């Protein structure tokens, strides 16, 4: 469907999650006028790739906390925590 809603769980690595994020409140939108947090890069054969994350996915929630209204730095901080796993709910435009 138009927006596929997926729940993806990244098994963290000492090198991180293997993704780059773009966007955030007050920053230049990744697409349209949407200030949300988006996956802009996925490292091939990295943790996020193994978890099924894809470029263009919109990040709605990280470890059960909404990113609604999040500035870029908040999203970065949310993804640089100590947990060995990162659960994210994303919307994927098909």
């Amino acid at each position: 469907i138009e927006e596929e809603e997926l729940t993806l769980t990244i098994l963290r690595q000492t090198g991180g999650l293997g993704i780059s994020i773009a966007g955030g409140k007050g920053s230049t939108p990744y697409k349209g006028d949407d200030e949300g947090i988006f996956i802009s890069r996925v490292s091939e054969e990295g943790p996020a790739a193994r978890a099924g994350v894809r470029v263009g996915d919109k990040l709605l929630e990280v470890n059960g906390v909404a990113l609604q209204g999040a500035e870029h730095h908040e999203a970065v901080e949310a993804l640089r925590g100590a947990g060995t796993a990162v659960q994210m709910r994303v919307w994927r435009e098909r």
């Binding site: 991180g16 999650l17 993704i19 773009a22 920053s27 230049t28 970065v76």
Partner: peptide, 8 residues
């Protein structure tokens, strides 16, 4: 504004 990207 600025188009921010951060590797994570």
């Amino acid at each position: 504004g600025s188009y921010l990207v951060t590797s994570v």
